[PDB]
Short mmCIF file of all heavy atoms in Angstrom, two decimals:
data_model
loop_
_atom_site.label_atom_id
_atom_site.label_comp_id
_atom_site.label_asym_id
_atom_site.label_seq_id
_atom_site.Cartn_x
_atom_site.Cartn_y
_atom_site.Cartn_z
N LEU E 215 31.55 -18.59 19.04
CA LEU E 215 32.26 -19.05 20.21
C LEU E 215 31.58 -20.19 20.92
O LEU E 215 32.22 -21.12 21.25
CB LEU E 215 32.46 -17.97 21.32
CG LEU E 215 32.86 -16.53 20.91
CD1 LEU E 215 33.25 -15.70 22.20
CD2 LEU E 215 33.98 -16.46 19.84
N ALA E 216 30.19 -20.14 21.01
CA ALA E 216 29.28 -21.13 21.57
C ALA E 216 29.36 -22.39 20.73
O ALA E 216 29.50 -23.47 21.31
CB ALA E 216 27.83 -20.68 21.67
N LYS E 217 29.48 -22.31 19.37
CA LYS E 217 29.73 -23.43 18.47
C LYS E 217 31.03 -24.12 18.66
O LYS E 217 31.13 -25.34 18.66
CB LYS E 217 29.68 -22.92 16.98
CG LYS E 217 28.21 -22.48 16.56
CD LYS E 217 28.30 -21.64 15.30
CE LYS E 217 26.95 -21.44 14.55
NZ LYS E 217 27.03 -20.47 13.43
N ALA E 218 32.15 -23.38 18.85
CA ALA E 218 33.51 -23.91 18.98
C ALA E 218 33.74 -24.74 20.24
O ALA E 218 34.16 -25.90 20.08
CB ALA E 218 34.50 -22.83 19.08
N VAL E 219 33.28 -24.27 21.40
CA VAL E 219 33.29 -25.03 22.60
C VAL E 219 32.36 -26.24 22.60
O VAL E 219 32.64 -27.28 23.15
CB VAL E 219 32.99 -24.19 23.84
CG1 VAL E 219 34.09 -23.20 24.09
CG2 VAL E 219 31.60 -23.52 23.75
N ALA E 220 31.19 -26.13 21.94
CA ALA E 220 30.17 -27.19 21.92
C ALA E 220 30.74 -28.42 21.19
O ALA E 220 30.40 -29.48 21.63
CB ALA E 220 28.90 -26.77 21.09
N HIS E 221 31.55 -28.20 20.12
CA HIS E 221 32.14 -29.18 19.27
C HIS E 221 33.29 -29.99 19.98
O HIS E 221 33.43 -31.23 19.79
CB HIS E 221 32.61 -28.50 17.99
CG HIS E 221 33.17 -29.36 16.91
ND1 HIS E 221 34.36 -29.03 16.23
CD2 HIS E 221 32.84 -30.56 16.34
CE1 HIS E 221 34.63 -30.03 15.31
NE2 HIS E 221 33.74 -30.94 15.33
N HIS E 222 34.01 -29.23 20.81
CA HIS E 222 35.24 -29.68 21.54
C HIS E 222 34.96 -30.81 22.62
O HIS E 222 35.69 -31.74 22.95
CB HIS E 222 35.98 -28.59 22.18
CG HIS E 222 37.38 -29.03 22.63
ND1 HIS E 222 38.03 -28.38 23.64
CD2 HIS E 222 38.33 -29.75 21.98
CE1 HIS E 222 39.34 -28.75 23.58
NE2 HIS E 222 39.59 -29.58 22.56
N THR E 223 33.76 -30.67 23.30
CA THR E 223 33.29 -31.51 24.35
C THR E 223 33.15 -32.97 23.93
O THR E 223 33.39 -33.91 24.68
CB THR E 223 31.89 -31.06 24.83
OG1 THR E 223 31.95 -29.66 25.11
CG2 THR E 223 31.50 -31.73 26.11
N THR E 224 32.64 -33.23 22.67
CA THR E 224 32.23 -34.47 22.12
C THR E 224 31.10 -35.12 23.01
O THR E 224 31.21 -36.18 23.61
CB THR E 224 33.41 -35.49 21.81
OG1 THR E 224 34.24 -35.85 22.87
CG2 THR E 224 34.33 -34.99 20.68
N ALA E 225 30.03 -34.43 23.11
CA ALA E 225 28.88 -34.77 23.90
C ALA E 225 27.65 -34.25 23.18
O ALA E 225 27.81 -33.60 22.14
CB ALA E 225 28.81 -34.07 25.30
N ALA E 226 26.41 -34.49 23.74
CA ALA E 226 25.17 -34.11 23.20
C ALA E 226 25.07 -32.65 23.29
O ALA E 226 25.57 -32.03 24.27
CB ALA E 226 23.95 -34.64 23.99
N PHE E 227 24.33 -32.06 22.32
CA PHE E 227 24.07 -30.60 22.30
C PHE E 227 22.66 -30.58 21.91
O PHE E 227 22.23 -31.14 20.94
CB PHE E 227 25.13 -29.87 21.29
CG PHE E 227 24.95 -28.37 21.21
CD1 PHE E 227 24.28 -27.66 22.19
CD2 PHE E 227 25.55 -27.62 20.18
CE1 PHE E 227 24.05 -26.31 22.04
CE2 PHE E 227 25.44 -26.16 20.17
CZ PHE E 227 24.73 -25.55 21.04
N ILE E 228 21.85 -29.87 22.71
CA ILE E 228 20.45 -29.61 22.55
C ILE E 228 20.38 -28.17 22.35
O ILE E 228 20.83 -27.36 23.18
CB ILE E 228 19.60 -30.01 23.69
CG1 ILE E 228 18.10 -29.63 23.45
CG2 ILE E 228 20.10 -29.53 25.13
CD1 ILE E 228 17.20 -30.43 24.37
N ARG E 229 19.88 -27.80 21.16
CA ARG E 229 19.88 -26.42 20.71
C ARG E 229 18.54 -26.13 20.34
O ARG E 229 17.97 -26.85 19.51
CB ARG E 229 20.77 -26.10 19.51
CG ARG E 229 20.82 -24.56 19.09
CD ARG E 229 22.23 -24.16 18.46
NE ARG E 229 22.17 -22.93 17.68
CZ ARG E 229 23.25 -22.24 17.28
NH1 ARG E 229 24.50 -22.69 17.66
NH2 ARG E 229 23.21 -21.09 16.55
N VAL E 230 17.88 -25.13 20.98
CA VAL E 230 16.54 -24.73 20.71
C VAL E 230 16.48 -23.24 20.52
O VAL E 230 17.27 -22.47 21.10
CB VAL E 230 15.55 -25.08 21.80
CG1 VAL E 230 15.43 -26.55 22.11
CG2 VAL E 230 15.80 -24.30 23.16
N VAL E 231 15.40 -22.72 19.80
CA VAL E 231 15.01 -21.34 19.60
C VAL E 231 13.92 -21.03 20.46
O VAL E 231 13.44 -22.00 21.06
CB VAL E 231 14.86 -21.09 18.10
CG1 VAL E 231 13.61 -21.77 17.54
CG2 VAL E 231 15.00 -19.57 17.80
N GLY E 232 13.56 -19.75 20.55
CA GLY E 232 12.55 -19.21 21.41
C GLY E 232 11.20 -19.70 20.99
O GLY E 232 10.36 -19.93 21.79
N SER E 233 11.05 -19.82 19.68
CA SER E 233 9.87 -20.20 18.95
C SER E 233 9.55 -21.67 19.29
O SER E 233 8.41 -22.09 19.33
CB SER E 233 10.02 -20.15 17.37
OG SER E 233 10.34 -18.78 16.94
N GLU E 234 10.53 -22.57 19.49
CA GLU E 234 10.40 -23.93 19.79
C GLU E 234 9.90 -24.07 21.25
O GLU E 234 9.28 -25.13 21.57
CB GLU E 234 11.70 -24.94 19.61
CG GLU E 234 11.81 -25.40 18.17
CD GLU E 234 12.68 -26.61 18.05
OE1 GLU E 234 13.92 -26.55 18.34
OE2 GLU E 234 12.19 -27.66 17.61
N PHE E 235 10.20 -23.12 22.19
CA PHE E 235 9.79 -23.16 23.57
C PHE E 235 8.30 -22.92 23.58
O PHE E 235 7.56 -23.73 24.15
CB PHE E 235 10.31 -21.98 24.47
CG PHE E 235 11.61 -22.21 25.21
CD1 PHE E 235 12.48 -21.11 25.28
CD2 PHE E 235 12.03 -23.43 25.74
CE1 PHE E 235 13.71 -21.22 25.92
CE2 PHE E 235 13.15 -23.46 26.61
CZ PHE E 235 14.05 -22.35 26.68
N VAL E 236 7.76 -21.92 22.88
CA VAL E 236 6.33 -21.63 22.84
C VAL E 236 5.54 -22.74 22.05
O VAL E 236 6.19 -23.50 21.37
CB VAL E 236 5.97 -20.23 22.30
CG1 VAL E 236 6.35 -19.11 23.31
CG2 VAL E 236 6.67 -20.07 20.97
N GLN E 237 4.17 -22.86 22.23
CA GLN E 237 3.28 -23.89 21.79
C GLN E 237 3.37 -24.43 20.47
O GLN E 237 4.01 -23.97 19.50
CB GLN E 237 1.74 -23.49 22.04
CG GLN E 237 1.31 -22.38 21.03
CD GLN E 237 2.07 -21.05 21.22
OE1 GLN E 237 2.16 -20.53 22.33
NE2 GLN E 237 2.74 -20.60 20.12
N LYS E 238 2.82 -25.64 20.40
CA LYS E 238 2.59 -26.39 19.19
C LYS E 238 1.19 -27.00 19.16
O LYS E 238 0.82 -27.63 18.14
CB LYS E 238 3.56 -27.55 18.97
CG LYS E 238 5.06 -27.03 19.06
CD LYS E 238 6.03 -28.24 18.78
CE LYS E 238 7.40 -28.06 19.49
NZ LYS E 238 8.22 -26.92 18.99
N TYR E 239 0.38 -26.79 20.18
CA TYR E 239 -0.95 -27.27 20.14
C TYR E 239 -1.75 -26.44 21.02
O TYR E 239 -2.75 -26.87 21.57
CB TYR E 239 -1.15 -28.73 20.71
CG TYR E 239 -0.31 -29.82 20.09
CD1 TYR E 239 0.95 -30.14 20.57
CD2 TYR E 239 -0.72 -30.46 18.94
CE1 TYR E 239 1.74 -31.06 19.94
CE2 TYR E 239 0.14 -31.37 18.23
CZ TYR E 239 1.39 -31.66 18.75
OH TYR E 239 2.44 -32.31 18.02
N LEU E 240 -1.23 -25.18 21.27
CA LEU E 240 -1.85 -24.26 22.12
C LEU E 240 -1.89 -24.55 23.59
O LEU E 240 -2.58 -25.43 24.06
CB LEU E 240 -3.23 -23.75 21.61
CG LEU E 240 -3.24 -23.19 20.20
CD1 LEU E 240 -4.68 -23.22 19.63
CD2 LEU E 240 -2.78 -21.74 20.21
N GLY E 241 -1.08 -23.81 24.33
CA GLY E 241 -0.81 -24.16 25.70
C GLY E 241 0.23 -25.25 25.88
O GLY E 241 0.60 -25.55 27.03
N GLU E 242 0.83 -25.90 24.85
CA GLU E 242 1.88 -26.90 24.90
C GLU E 242 3.11 -26.17 25.37
O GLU E 242 3.94 -26.75 25.96
CB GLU E 242 2.11 -27.61 23.59
CG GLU E 242 3.01 -28.92 23.69
CD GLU E 242 4.54 -28.64 23.49
OE1 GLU E 242 4.98 -27.82 22.68
OE2 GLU E 242 5.25 -29.49 24.12
N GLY E 243 3.19 -24.84 25.05
CA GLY E 243 4.41 -24.17 25.18
C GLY E 243 5.04 -24.17 26.54
O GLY E 243 6.20 -24.41 26.65
N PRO E 244 4.35 -23.94 27.65
CA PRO E 244 5.10 -24.05 28.99
C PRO E 244 5.59 -25.42 29.38
O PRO E 244 6.52 -25.45 30.22
CB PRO E 244 4.17 -23.40 29.99
CG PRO E 244 3.29 -22.41 29.13
CD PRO E 244 3.16 -23.06 27.75
N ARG E 245 4.94 -26.48 28.92
CA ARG E 245 5.22 -27.84 29.21
C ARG E 245 6.57 -28.17 28.58
O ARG E 245 7.46 -28.74 29.21
CB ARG E 245 4.09 -28.78 28.51
CG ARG E 245 4.49 -30.28 28.45
CD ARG E 245 4.10 -31.14 29.66
NE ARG E 245 4.54 -30.45 30.94
CZ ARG E 245 5.52 -30.94 31.77
NH1 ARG E 245 6.37 -32.01 31.38
NH2 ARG E 245 5.63 -30.52 33.07
N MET E 246 6.74 -27.64 27.26
CA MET E 246 7.94 -27.80 26.50
C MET E 246 9.20 -27.21 27.11
O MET E 246 10.26 -27.84 27.06
CB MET E 246 7.71 -27.07 25.18
CG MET E 246 8.78 -27.35 24.17
SD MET E 246 9.45 -29.06 23.89
CE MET E 246 10.29 -28.77 22.28
N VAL E 247 9.02 -26.15 27.87
CA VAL E 247 10.05 -25.52 28.65
C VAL E 247 10.65 -26.39 29.70
O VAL E 247 11.84 -26.47 29.93
CB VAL E 247 9.52 -24.27 29.24
CG1 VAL E 247 10.61 -23.46 29.93
CG2 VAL E 247 9.03 -23.33 28.10
N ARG E 248 9.76 -27.22 30.41
CA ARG E 248 10.23 -28.16 31.44
C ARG E 248 11.01 -29.25 30.78
O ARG E 248 12.06 -29.62 31.28
CB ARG E 248 9.09 -28.75 32.23
CG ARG E 248 8.03 -27.71 32.72
CD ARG E 248 8.45 -26.42 33.47
NE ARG E 248 9.30 -26.78 34.64
CZ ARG E 248 10.19 -25.89 35.18
NH1 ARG E 248 10.22 -24.56 34.77
NH2 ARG E 248 11.17 -26.25 36.09
N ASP E 249 10.53 -29.80 29.59
CA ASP E 249 10.99 -30.95 28.88
C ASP E 249 12.40 -30.76 28.46
O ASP E 249 13.12 -31.74 28.62
CB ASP E 249 9.91 -31.18 27.78
CG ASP E 249 10.25 -32.46 27.05
OD1 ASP E 249 10.01 -33.53 27.66
OD2 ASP E 249 10.65 -32.34 25.86
N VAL E 250 12.82 -29.60 27.84
CA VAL E 250 14.10 -29.42 27.22
C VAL E 250 15.20 -29.52 28.22
O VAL E 250 16.22 -30.15 27.95
CB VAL E 250 14.22 -28.22 26.29
CG1 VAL E 250 13.30 -28.18 25.13
CG2 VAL E 250 13.98 -26.91 27.12
N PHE E 251 15.04 -28.91 29.43
CA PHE E 251 16.03 -28.91 30.44
C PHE E 251 16.34 -30.22 31.08
O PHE E 251 17.51 -30.60 31.29
CB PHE E 251 15.76 -27.93 31.59
CG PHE E 251 15.90 -26.51 31.03
CD1 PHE E 251 14.70 -25.76 31.03
CD2 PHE E 251 17.08 -25.92 30.56
CE1 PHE E 251 14.64 -24.46 30.52
CE2 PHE E 251 17.06 -24.61 30.16
CZ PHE E 251 15.83 -23.95 30.04
N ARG E 252 15.25 -31.02 31.34
CA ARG E 252 15.34 -32.34 31.94
C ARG E 252 15.97 -33.34 31.07
O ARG E 252 16.63 -34.21 31.50
CB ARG E 252 13.93 -33.00 32.27
CG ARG E 252 13.20 -32.34 33.36
CD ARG E 252 11.82 -32.93 33.69
NE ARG E 252 10.82 -32.85 32.61
CZ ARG E 252 10.33 -33.92 31.92
NH1 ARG E 252 10.40 -35.13 32.58
NH2 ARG E 252 9.62 -33.85 30.74
N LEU E 253 15.72 -33.22 29.75
CA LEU E 253 16.19 -34.11 28.64
C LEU E 253 17.73 -34.02 28.58
O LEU E 253 18.38 -35.03 28.52
CB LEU E 253 15.73 -33.91 27.23
CG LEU E 253 16.21 -34.92 26.17
CD1 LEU E 253 15.94 -36.33 26.53
CD2 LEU E 253 15.56 -34.53 24.83
N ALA E 254 18.31 -32.77 28.74
CA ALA E 254 19.72 -32.49 28.81
C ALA E 254 20.36 -33.16 30.02
O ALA E 254 21.48 -33.65 29.93
CB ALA E 254 19.93 -30.98 29.01
N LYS E 255 19.67 -33.22 31.18
CA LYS E 255 20.16 -33.83 32.43
C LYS E 255 20.23 -35.31 32.11
O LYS E 255 21.21 -35.92 32.51
CB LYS E 255 19.28 -33.63 33.69
CG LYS E 255 19.26 -32.18 34.25
CD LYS E 255 18.05 -31.81 35.11
CE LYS E 255 17.78 -32.58 36.48
NZ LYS E 255 19.01 -32.46 37.31
N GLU E 256 19.22 -36.01 31.40
CA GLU E 256 19.28 -37.46 31.23
C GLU E 256 20.52 -37.85 30.44
O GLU E 256 21.24 -38.82 30.74
CB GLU E 256 18.05 -38.05 30.50
CG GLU E 256 16.65 -37.65 31.00
CD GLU E 256 15.52 -38.37 30.38
OE1 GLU E 256 15.42 -39.63 30.47
OE2 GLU E 256 14.63 -37.72 29.78
N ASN E 257 20.88 -37.05 29.38
CA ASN E 257 22.01 -37.20 28.50
C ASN E 257 23.07 -36.13 28.79
O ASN E 257 23.50 -35.38 27.93
CB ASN E 257 21.61 -37.45 27.03
CG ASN E 257 20.64 -36.44 26.50
OD1 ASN E 257 20.65 -35.24 26.91
ND2 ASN E 257 19.75 -36.89 25.59
N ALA E 258 23.52 -36.03 30.11
CA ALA E 258 24.53 -35.12 30.54
C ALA E 258 25.85 -35.85 30.47
O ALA E 258 25.86 -37.09 30.67
CB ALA E 258 24.37 -34.64 32.05
N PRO E 259 26.98 -35.19 30.18
CA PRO E 259 27.23 -33.79 29.92
C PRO E 259 26.47 -33.37 28.72
O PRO E 259 26.32 -34.15 27.79
CB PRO E 259 28.82 -33.68 29.78
CG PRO E 259 29.27 -35.11 29.56
CD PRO E 259 28.20 -35.94 30.29
N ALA E 260 25.94 -32.15 28.63
CA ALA E 260 25.21 -31.64 27.57
C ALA E 260 25.15 -30.17 27.84
O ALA E 260 25.56 -29.63 28.89
CB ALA E 260 23.79 -32.13 27.48
N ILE E 261 24.80 -29.52 26.76
CA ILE E 261 24.70 -28.08 26.65
C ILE E 261 23.31 -27.76 26.21
O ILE E 261 22.92 -28.37 25.19
CB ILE E 261 25.66 -27.59 25.62
CG1 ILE E 261 27.11 -28.24 25.82
CG2 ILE E 261 25.72 -26.06 25.62
CD1 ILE E 261 28.18 -27.67 24.94
N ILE E 262 22.62 -26.76 26.90
CA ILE E 262 21.40 -26.13 26.44
C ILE E 262 21.66 -24.72 25.97
O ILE E 262 22.13 -23.80 26.66
CB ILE E 262 20.28 -26.12 27.47
CG1 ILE E 262 18.91 -25.44 27.06
CG2 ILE E 262 20.92 -25.64 28.84
CD1 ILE E 262 18.32 -26.06 25.79
#
Side-chain angles (χ1 to χ4, degrees):
Chain E
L215 318 189
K217 293 164 165 172
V219 293
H221 184 226
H222 194 204
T223 309
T224 57
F227 180 20
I228 177 161
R229 183 149 161 166
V230 301
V231 72
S233 299
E234 276 198 296
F235 268 141
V236 288
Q237 72 295 310
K238 307 182 208 294
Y239 305 89
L240 307 159
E242 193 269 322
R245 165 89 311 246
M246 191 43 165
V247 188
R248 314 309 306 156
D249 185 75
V250 300
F251 292 114
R252 292 179 297 112
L253 183 53
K255 290 157 63 55
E256 310 187 60
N257 52 32
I261 313 188
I262 179 56

